[PDB]
Design a binder for these strands. Structure first.
Ligand SMILES: [Zn+2]
Ligand SMILES: [Zn+2]
Lengths: 61, 88, 237, 50
RNA sequence: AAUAGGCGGCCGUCGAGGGCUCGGGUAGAAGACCCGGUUGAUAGGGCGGGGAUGUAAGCGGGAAGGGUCAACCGACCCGCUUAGUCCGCCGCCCCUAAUCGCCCGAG
RNA sequence: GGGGCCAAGGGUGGGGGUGUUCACCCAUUAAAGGGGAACGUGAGCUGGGUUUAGACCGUCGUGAGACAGGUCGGAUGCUA
RNA sequence: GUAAGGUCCGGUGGAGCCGCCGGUAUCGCGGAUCCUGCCGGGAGUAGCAGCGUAGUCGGGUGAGAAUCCCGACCGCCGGAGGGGCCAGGGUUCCACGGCAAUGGUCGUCAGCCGUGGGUUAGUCGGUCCUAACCCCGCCCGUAACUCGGCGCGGGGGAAAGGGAAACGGGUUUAUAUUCCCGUACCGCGGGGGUAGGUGCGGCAACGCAAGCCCGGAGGGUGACGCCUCGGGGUAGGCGGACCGGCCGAUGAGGCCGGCUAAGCGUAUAAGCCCGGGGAGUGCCGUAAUGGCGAGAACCGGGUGAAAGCGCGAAUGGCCCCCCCGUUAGGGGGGUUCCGCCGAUCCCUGGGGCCCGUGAAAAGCCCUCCGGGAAUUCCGAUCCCCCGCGACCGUACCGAGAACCGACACAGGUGCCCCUGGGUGAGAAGCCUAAGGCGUGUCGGGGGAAACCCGGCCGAGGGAACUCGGCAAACUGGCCCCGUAACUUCGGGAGAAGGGGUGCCUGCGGGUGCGUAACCCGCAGGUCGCAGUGACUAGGGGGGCCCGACUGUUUAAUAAAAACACAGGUCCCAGCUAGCCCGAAAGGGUUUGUACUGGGGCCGACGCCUGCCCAGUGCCGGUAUGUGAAGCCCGGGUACAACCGGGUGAAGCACCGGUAAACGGCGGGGGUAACUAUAACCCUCUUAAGGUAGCGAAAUUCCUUGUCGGUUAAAUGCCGACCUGCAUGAAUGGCGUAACGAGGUCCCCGCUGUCCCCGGCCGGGGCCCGGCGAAACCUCUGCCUGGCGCGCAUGCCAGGGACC
RNA sequence: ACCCGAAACCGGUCGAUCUAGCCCGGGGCAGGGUGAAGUCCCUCAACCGAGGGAUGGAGGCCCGCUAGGGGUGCUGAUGUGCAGUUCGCUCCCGUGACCCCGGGCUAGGGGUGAAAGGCCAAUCGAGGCCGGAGAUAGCUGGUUCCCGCCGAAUCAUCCCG
RNA sequence: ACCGAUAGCGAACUAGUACCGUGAGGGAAAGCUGAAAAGCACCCCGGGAGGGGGGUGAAAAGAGCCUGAAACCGGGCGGCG
RNA sequence: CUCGCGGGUGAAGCCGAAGUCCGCUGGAACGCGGCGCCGGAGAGGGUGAUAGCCCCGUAGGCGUAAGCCCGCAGGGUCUC
RNA sequence: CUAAGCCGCCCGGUGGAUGGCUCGGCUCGGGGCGCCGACGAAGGGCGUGGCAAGCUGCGAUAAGCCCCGGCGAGGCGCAGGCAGCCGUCGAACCGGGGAUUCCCGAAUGGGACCUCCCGCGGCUUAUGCCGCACUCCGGGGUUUAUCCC
């Protein structure tokens, strides 16, 4: 096991769905928060200075 | 069948239609008969039915015409006797 | 190293949490304001089996309209009347302050302090013996054999807890043990530190023996108190 | 799949409308410069973002 | 066999000889090899010989018994029956196909 | 029979315990020779021993653990 | 020009470029198992087999047909390759028009390309309720927070839990419980009547239309585990009669059709009741358990399911026949009974089990309390009629091509729910009906080999093969006789071993009204080598080691003697406890309370578990010594720093308990010489010197110990001795029935394991037509003796060699 | 600091669709055998008792290609595979400590573990992603035009050398 | 006194795009006809794709478009064979 | 402070000199040879080749609503 | 007039180096300009063109609507096409001022396993409009609920 036969069990509920705030498919549906912008867990955006994705969004790196 | 019908809370019956087709009819199970509040034995004069069937009937066709229809006759007579004796 | 089972239990994970939603509810006395200076009469409605209690439970309806759950004493009968208060008669199933209970009586469900709801002698088949009565304290012999002093106003129930002799019959089967421990979510089956790895237990190692004496000090830090903790002695005497 | 929320259905509708070829008159106007767009999709090979 | 041989015959300074194609194996992984090709029994077909199984279908009779002790049913047995079926073996008979055609080739 | 010379064309086999090479033993035999070929030969095979990861016993070590000490299990890739 | 390079000539090219002086720089490439791009040999080669080997003939279309279409034949699946439908996919669905690319070959075909379309709901699902659980506010902690948290208030949380209401026929290329027709139901509101407000029948169980509006309470229902059995019913199946059609010989016979939804009305069974009645040297009843003066037989009744029956409904569907048939159409017939089996599908009752107790709330029904309106009036849960009923999903696949795994992937998700006939105990195997397919998609040829994979057979011997009977082979179902050691008395056990088995003819028996259905015997006749004839379908026995057993484990080299287990025993803890998480706040055990919670070790069961507290741990005491800061006293400092002394907790020193706490349990001489050799015995020595058991052991180095059995032969196996290098009693000792894909030895039987290999079948290999790679590659590539970094295709001397 | 290469350490975040554990709600397991408790019946005797016949359905019971689950041997096929763990034969469990599904919780010196250092998304003796970071090495590899002149050393002392 | 499309920001262009991972996050390749489309009318062949003539242009620079190097492949010629 | 007045500044923007003369090559002159001109303009770009005078522009000037700033005049408050 | 094969030149194919070009990058002394949002921000989702897929721009008034001013004859984005339409009553374009501005989003009346749903009070005939999150500050009222404004 642990390989090809394991990958066949991905027909359940997806871990992440689209987020209403940031528009990315990163909303943890079971827990109820976004892994990208923190929607549903914080009023402020999830920004980390070790991360370059939000800079990539606006070509500011 | 649908996963909702795969549950055993539904009653499944195979029925032949007038046009010659075979279809499955699904129904919900009936509630159990009412029981006495004091001894737990079955009551009389109270038909079994789902809420729609119960609402399909008039008032007097759902309980017997005697005091305390929630008790079996033995418990009802006993309670009446205790009340009468306690009053005196 | 890695954590121990006792260390992991303190974090409250569902592996160790008690499933306190399939049980019948906590068994506590009625508030002390009702019982003080007044005697209440109740009727036993039903006797049921609490999934995790080791003792049967009973439902009591009082004349004031309060419905309560009590630990059923041995011989308690459905439909019988019971009394709680200073003036209650001395009979099985009646709750009285410890000052009004005659010496030599068997009691259970004793409040540690007046009005706490009952803390002692609650397991099935257990009873305590009233030894002496004094204006300042009442001495009772507990199931463990200790003589303990209680306030005279502490409440207790006369009788013996039902369900005794439960250990007379062996469990026989690992399946029986599995069901018994799954009913209350107790860690089962249990492993052995000697067969654990060195990273996991103080006794762990390739050779299945403890490398140090198994009597551990009372002052040992958490993650070290295994084996015989602060043992006065060991072996068979 | 049988039961779908309206918002997800609308997003799938937008993707379906996006998936089409470049107009021939657009190709003629651009003089064989604009031949395709990066939103072309094959339902069995390249999957949707959602 | 680099001393890369000998002899008989046919051919050249249009042409001896050969290949593909054809019917078959004394042969075979492709190539190659061997017999036959109307100067004909090579294969098929017909007939006959020899062999292998084991007595065909159909009909007549019998059959332990049953059946209104009648009609009729009946596993199985006997006679026509060394039968029937089959032959990657042989012999005889040109009835059928071995035809037509294409190519190389020293000077 | 014992010792030696020429002579390498041919032969020099089958079985019991043991992973064994070897050594020992059995019944035959003319005899049942010793060696080299990357201790010939795993892009020919087998995988019993040895030499990982699991586990047991004995001894040693406070311990983690170790033993050219035993013991059970433990993968053999190929279109020239 | 030594050279790094420079410059001319001929050609291509169409717009910039150079000499010298002085500055400046991402300034010069063959390597970095360098980076990016492109292209070679391998190669027109491998692969397009294995687990389901499927096509052929005639016709059609088209430029083009093994591959597309129709008919026939022949096949495969048939408890799934058939039917339905989730999650996931998101247009893959339908029609028309096409083959540049995709499809393992071709293609006129397509899940491909292009152009147009397609998803219709008061009743199906979401929407409502709550479960495990989650979020927000206050509060507390944190330097702080988007971080942690108890308690209060609020909210969310199931497309398989609870939960108002629709079912036939028809219609489209593609939607239909949604559109059309027919017949219904539910919720809200309204109109007209009526029951009731102010009404009756029964001893009773109860039968009844049995007043309206607001608020509250109670009861019931919603509402529940596992095992097992009886009763009732329905789908489905079988046999017979009859009417149409087909086949068959217009014989016998076989096959096909002979159909009936919701809704409305209607009642019995079990269970439970209600009146009468008054038993025992006892009656009554069940499959079974069982019931009776705490009220049985027995006679009456009440309430109470799934179903059946009537309307719906024969103008509908099905089958057949006739006239018109150039296209297009129009009519006439029937659709009826009996018997048997019978569910895993529904209803309903018993019984048994738990150291296991197998959800909540919304909703609905009834009853009871208070309050309000009503008399030329109020007014229904009853009858008739009318109006309204929102938002979102609805196509399609649902998998050996529509999902995930990079793929038209032999895996996984979903085999998640369902199954005609025969044989048969069987949802087994085999054949077959319906339904589906020839797309688990490259075809053609062939004594066309060798060799490989899968299968069948093999004379004589029967393990001589091998580490090892690996693999294969023997046995096999059912009926009847018969069955050992040992044992925990349950088992071992289907031990072992022996006999029978087909077909036909005819009787007897059980239950049954039955000559319906199922099952069990008897007698006779007869055929073959073989009668569980195919299919299905144990080989068996005796010792030893380990683990009691069922179970679990290293997903991807170890399934075990390893882990777990019930049982034994030890330790801590009376609750603001013991143990544990955390920075804190708070928290887990805990809706708990010693028959409990937590922490070790051994490990079923039977008999037992000896000695040692000197050491290392743990526990209790601590008179006495030491023992930090603080405090006090003296000196010093115009104040301090600094120095000396006293007080001095815990901890060590010291003392005592404790080994089912960690561990340990020795060593020399001589004897009792009724020979020789053993311990009775006397000397150092420690805390003590290994007791009961077992022993060449999974522990033994010498070792293949010695003796006995097993063989012709025994580094094996079993039994015994004890010299135990280096066994031993809960890191347990010994023994042990049953159990085991564990290791090990032997015996009968069996066989191609072997002597010794030989035939046959299917698929590859081989050839032909197509698609068409990769691993790898310094350039190359013959040998003998040598030199050499010490084993050279390439160097030296020789030998040989056409491509 | 001429250029490239480490295993590793540290911070903040992301993951329980694989798999491990536990909680709430659900679906499933043809057919056959054996025969525990319990409830009895009959005959001969009667001071003891002996013999025979039933019913009953329990089990971490038995056989079993039912479905489903597992993975012993062939060390079989395949091993640039159908497949980055599959296929065939053989074998084991198959009413229970059973198998599977939807909703939840436990997150990295942490979880979970019938304890194999196993499992935590093809990764586990400390996961993944980005950041510290171009980390460091006395160790390995590489370092690009030509001519002209001169032209070595591997020996002494000291360094965890 | 910077680079001149493997350089310069990752992106000279429908670039933080396509695409990979459940997720944090990771992240390309891709510029040029001609002065003017004057972008080849008509004929023969082919099912088509295209081929041959004939035209436009100073030049096919022919859209598979400025120059077209090297590696590699096919043919012709010279030399060996 | 502005019922009022004046000025400055302040958008899009406007003006802004001089060959497109003859011959040659050329598909096309920005090239070559000859003859001229402007220049506070010979920076740069486009235009069918490399252009001071073909065009944009440049050297030098002009205009601009709202808004902003300063001042005049008038009306007030406060400080010493 | 040797078959394969080998080297060199020429022609052709494959490929895309070199050269020339540049509306793009990079770096700078100096100068300018520097916050938006409950009067609902930034970031997103979805729509919007006659033929319209991507980018860009806009928002159901949707490559756009209105008004003063500048320019002065063409215009309808990147983007070379078909057919049309707009402009002399001054467009396109440009500076300034207005109108429209769906849904999610601090998201705010209450909820989100899907950027979509479900309410309560006033006015309004109806269409329709406004108000209703939490933690506070300055005030009023009462029911004294921290309830309403
Ligand atoms: Zn987000
Ligand atoms: Zn009652």
């Amino acid at each position: 096991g642990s390989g090809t036969a394991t990958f066949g069990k991905r027909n359940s509920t997806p871990t992440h769905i689209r987020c209403r705030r940031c528009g990315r498919v990163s909303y943890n549906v079971k827990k109820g928060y976004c892994a990208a912008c923190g929607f549903g867990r914080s009023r402020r955006l999830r920004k980390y200075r070790w991360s370059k994705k939000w800079k990539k969004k606006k070509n500011a790196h | 069948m649908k996963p909702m019908y795969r549950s055993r809370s539904w009653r499944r019956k195979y029925v032949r239609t007038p046009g010659g087709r075979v279809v499955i009819h699904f129904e919900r199970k009936k509630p159990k008969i009412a029981h006495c509040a004091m001894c737990g034995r079955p009551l009389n004069g109270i038909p079994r039915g789902r809420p729609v069937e119960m609402r399909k009937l008039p008032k007097t066709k759902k309980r017997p015409e005697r005091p305390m229809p929630h008790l079996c006759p033995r418990c009802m007579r006993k309670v009446m006797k205790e009340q009468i004796r306690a009053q005196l | 190293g890695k954590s121990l089972i006792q260390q992991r239990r303190g974090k409250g994970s569902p592996t160790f949490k008690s499933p306190s939603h399939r049980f019948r509810g906590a068994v506590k006395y009625i508030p002390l304001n009702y019982t003080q200076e007044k005697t209440l009469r109740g009727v036993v409605e039903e006797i049921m089996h609490d999934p995790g209690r080791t003792a049967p439970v009973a439902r009591v309806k009082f004349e004031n309209g309060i419905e309560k759950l009590i630990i059923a004493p041995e011989g308690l009968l459905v439909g019988q009347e019971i009394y709680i208060g200073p003036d209650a008669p001395i009979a099985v199933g009646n709750t009285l302050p410890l000052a009004k209970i005659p010496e030599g009586t068997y009691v259970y469900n004793i409040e540690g302090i007046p009005g706490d709801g009952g803390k002692y002698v609650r397991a099935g088949g257990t009873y305590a013996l009233v030894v002496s009565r004094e204006p300042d304290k009442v001495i009772v012999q507990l199931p463990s054999g200790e003589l303990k002093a209680f306030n005279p106003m502490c409440r207790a129930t006369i009788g013996v807890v039902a369900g005794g002799g439960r250990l007379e019959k062996p469990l026989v089967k690992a399946g029986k043990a599995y069901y018994k421990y799954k009913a209350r979510n107790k860690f089962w089956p249990t492993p052995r530190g000697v067969k654990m790895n060195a990273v996991n237990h103080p006794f762990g190692g390739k050779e299945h023996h403890p490398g140090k004496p198994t009597t551990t000090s009372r002052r040992a830090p958490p993650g070290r108190k295994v084996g015989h903790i602060a043992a006065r002695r060991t072996g068979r005497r | 799949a049988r039961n779908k929320p309206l918002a997800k259905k609308l997003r799938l509708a937008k993707a379906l409308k996006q998936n089409r070829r470049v107009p021939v008159w657009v190709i003629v106007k651009t003089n064989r410069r604009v031949l395709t767009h990066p939103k072309r999709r094959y339902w069995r090979r390249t999957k949707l973002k959602e």
